[PDB]
Amino acid sequence: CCPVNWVEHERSCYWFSRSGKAWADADNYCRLEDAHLVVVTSWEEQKFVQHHIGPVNTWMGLHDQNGPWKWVDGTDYETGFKNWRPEQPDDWYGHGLGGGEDCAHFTDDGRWNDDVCQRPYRWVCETEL
Ligand SMILES: CC(=O)N[C@@H]1[C@@H](O)[C@@H](O)[C@@H](CO)O[C@@H]1O
Ligand SMILES: [Ca+2]
Ligand SMILES: [Ca+2]
Ligand SMILES: [Ca+2]
To answer: Which of 115, 118, 121 to mutate for ligand 1's pocket (most ligand atoms within 8 Å of CB)?
Structure first.
């Protein structure tokens, strides 16, 4: 029951961009498709997303812009699945662009990193059947 060009996996529909956007723009894009930036809650979902994105930095629906880490659909962060690269998240200021790092993304090996929300990365939308 997914729209055309979306991939079905375990009762969810996924859309994989092939262009980049800043996190806020990617978030708005997903909402306009009645969807949300991907929310990863299991190792099997993590492996499925990794297969389709390949070795490319790609935004997910996890951020700490207003305080603590939150998933865009209200899924609890603390008790949920996490796949940070060791030493991440680190809220790095050293990029010199202003502020720390408030948006999560998959890195080239699948492990997560927090980075500057303005960066243009590919993104994934998800909707639940
Ligand atoms: C893309 C990526 O992994 N970026 C990270 C950045 O977010 C920050 O953690 C930095 C710390 O030295 O290490 C990397 O450059
Ligand atoms: Ca999900
Ligand atoms: Ca942060
Ligand atoms: Ca980081």
So the answer is: 115
| Contact residues for 105 (Cβ-Cβ < 8 A; gap 6+) | 57, 58, 59, 60, 112, 113, 115, 121
Query: What are the structural domain ranges in the chain?
Result: 1-129
Cβ neighbours, 10 Å, residue 126: 25
Method used to solve the structure: X-ray
Distance CA 62, CA 9 (A): 20
Runs of H (alpha helix) within 1-129: 23-32, 43-53
Which tokens go with 42? 């299991």
**Ligand 2: centre distance to CA 37 (Å):** 9
Position of tokens 């990794």? 50
Q: What is the resolution in angstroms?
A: 1.2
CB neighbourhood size of 57 (10 A): 16
Residues at the annotated binding site for Ca(2+)?
39, 45, 64, 88, 90-91, 101-102, 113-114, 126
